[PDB]
């Protein structure tokens, strides 16, 4: 069948940014519920099991703008006291509610640390090589959770 709203799709992919390969592997996801970046879902939309294609997903359909207001000054004491805080250092934090919050230190002045809160792929165009491996309809549980499941293990989130 074809990829579309509420299918669980399995893909094999290679993700390349600026001619360099960043990730590759296989995943299943529930289509039509924001589980992938919108532009990759858009390229998958309507495709049949078996297709292999290249998709250039522009920044505005991937991780969005590198927003200048995401670059802010925060105090040194905000970091663990044994952390190496120097220009260019990367940190991987978790934002109040729990989400990823990768960050980059761009400047350090006494107790003042200039931090970039933007996602690392902000403003990057992404190139995928994709194979559509499997398309199936979702179970009621998968529809209820908003995502794909591997097997028959009843659970909650
Ligand atoms: Ni679940």
Listed by start position, the domains of the chain span 1-157
Fold held by 1-157: Chitinase A; domain 3 (3.10.50)
Q: Cβ neighbours of residue 139 under 8 Å, at least 6 residues apart?
A: 149
Residue among 82, 96, 89, 94 nearest 114 (CA): 89
**Experimental method reported for this structure:** X-ray
Tell me, in angstroms, the distance from the centre of ligand 1 to residue 2's CA.
23
Tell me, in angstroms, the distance from the centre of ligand 1 to residue 155's CA.
6
Residue among 154, 85, 82, 92 nearest 119 (CA): 92
Alpha-carbon separation of residue 103 from 29, 71, 72, 82 (angstroms): 27, 10, 11, 17
Helix (H) / strand (E) element for 123: namely: none
Tell me, in angstroms, the distance from the centre of ligand 1 to residue 36's CA.
16
Tell me, in angstroms, the distance from the centre of ligand 1 to residue 28's CA.
13
Give binding residues for Ca(2+) as ranges.
16, 33, 35, 49, 52
Tell me, in angstroms, the distance from the centre of ligand 1 to residue 30's CA.
11
Q: How far apart are CA 100 and CA 92, in angstroms?
A: 7
Tell me, in angstroms, the distance from the centre of ligand 1 to residue 156's CA.
6
Give the Cβ contact number of residue 43 at 10 Å.
19
DSSP classification of residue 124: -
Tell me, in angstroms, the distance from the centre of ligand 1 to residue 148's CA.
7
Across 18-85, the runs of DSSP E, i.e. the strands, are 20-30, 52-57, 71-75
């Amino acid at each position: 069948m074809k990829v579309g709203q509420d299918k669980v799709v399995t893909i094999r992919y290679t993700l390349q940014v600026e001619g360099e390969v960043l990730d590759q592997g296989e995943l299943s996801y529930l289509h039509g519920h924001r589980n992938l970046i919108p532009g990759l879902e858009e390229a998958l939309e309507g495709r049949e099991e078996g297709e292999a294609f290249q998709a250039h997903v522009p920044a505005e359909k991937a991780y969005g703008p590198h927003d200048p207001e995401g670059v802010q000054v925060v105090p040194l004491s905000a970091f663990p006291e044994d952390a190496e805080v120097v220009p260019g250092a990367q940190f991987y934090a978790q934002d109040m509610e729990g989400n990823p919050m990768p960050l980059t230190v761009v400047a350090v002045e006494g107790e003042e640390v200039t931090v970039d809160f933007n996602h690392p792929l902000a403003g990057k165009d992404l190139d995928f090589q994709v194979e559509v491996v499997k398309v199936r309809e979702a179970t009621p549980e998968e529809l209820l959770h908003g995502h794909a499941h591997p097997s028959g293990h009843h659970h909650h989130h």
